């Protein structure tokens, strides 16, 4: 429900590699959960990568803070990807590491 | 129905300690009641904690009289916060100590 | 139907205290009749008393004139208030005596 | 259908007193036909006798000529009027007189 | 479906004169077709014209090429017309002679 | 679903010959698939022309990098175009070929 999480542009990187700068992406911590987030060879293929770490930046209107980066840590997928943008994705855990 | 109650930027405090910048909330007094909200680490941690005081502005745009503070005086959620936005609470008093 | 009346940004006063900067209100003469509006201590406080003079500035765009001033002449909501922001009320009379 | 005529601004006049600054209004030819349209003393006055002239401005945007005036020649509706503001009724005649 | 037309303001014309200037209109090629269109004497009067030639600018926004004129060459609707502004016609053909 | 894919503002060439200056168009790998797309003379030309290749500029908002060219590589739909606009079409390969 309201136990969603979301950040505005962000980047995956696999391995070290940037393969996609993701744009508006909301998982939802169920912090292992799963989520959501919608995406240029590069990024297409850091996506065939989450699809076998998303770090962005945090979008809390609340502000409690500040704003923050967030990390996402951690095949259908994957052959779903051979060609809507919403893509769905499961992180295996969530990240508030630092501020900006 | 319209016995609500709603206020733009706010601030909930775990016994003094400031731990997340919410966004819009609207409750609800049944001054004890029910309402949500809307929310990084330290507003994500007071969050935990409103789980187990917020303060903000209210947002009555009939301006009876200006705008003063609210506050909302005073487990499942706890879990759920492991991992949408709007985030279910229940105050049990509610508050306009001043103006602004 | 199309027999309704509202206005914008009003006051409501109880017996001659302002108690409640109500913004939008819509009524509908059933010059009884029943209607709604949108309402920071006085304004509630104002509310708690139209519960147990509402006057706006009339809204009509048609503007068969200009813009007028209008008044709404003259307990379950009582409680309902003790915590939507559409609230109900029933004005026991309407006027549009001057002009502005 | 889009046998339909409406016209921005408009004033309607009872045997020569304007009565309501009637705003956008909306006929139908059946040149008689029904309609409907949206209207402070006066003007309500004026809509009380519509009950028992609407001239406004043309708003048809294909501009098959430029902008003219139009005028719409010619009890429970009075009843209803004594407290939504999209009111219902019925000319016997329209007219596209003069330009503007 | 797709396979749709539609420009711009435009006029139509009956026999020589201009009798309305009809804003957007949204055709079908079935060039025969059937279509639609939304709409002062002079206009009406058209109308009542082609009830019983539409030459607009087209509003392609793909723009294979840029921006052309858009023509369509070619009783109950002559009398819905005695009185919605969406009103439907049926083209015989039509035309994207020149550029603009 | 997310596995979409859409760019803005393209053209189709036929052989070598552009076609029509199609806007918004929107695939889905299925890098054979199917999709749709919005599109004078030559544009419609080169519709008819795809009916019996779409080279644009990519959307996706995400950036993973930043912004290149997308190629769609390759009679009922013939006849549809005798005459709304999201026409559908069926590339047998995509390509993000160069940035820009």
Known sequence: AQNTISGKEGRLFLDGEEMAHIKTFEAN?????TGTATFSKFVLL?????????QAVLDDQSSGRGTERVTLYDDSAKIASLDEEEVPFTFEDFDVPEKL
């Open 29 to 33: 911590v169920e912090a292992n959960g």
């Open 46 to 54: 850091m996506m065939d990568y989450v699809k076998k770490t998303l």
